Amino acid sequence: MSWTDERVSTLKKLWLDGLSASQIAKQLGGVTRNAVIGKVHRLGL
DNA sequence: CCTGATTCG
């Protein structure tokens, strides 16, 4: 499991949609909510 | 419909 352009694309949409980090981690899968907050922070979303 | 931000290794 890695951060593909698609998986980052999915992450972009949902974080902007206002979903909690745990819900986001749930849909993506194979990634803890910690890692989600980590990636968002780096992209400055 | 179970916090996010920021540091740390």
Add this chain to the structure above:
DNA sequence: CCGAATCAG
């Protein structure tokens, strides 16, 4: 860069 471990409201 990554995600766990802290920091912070």
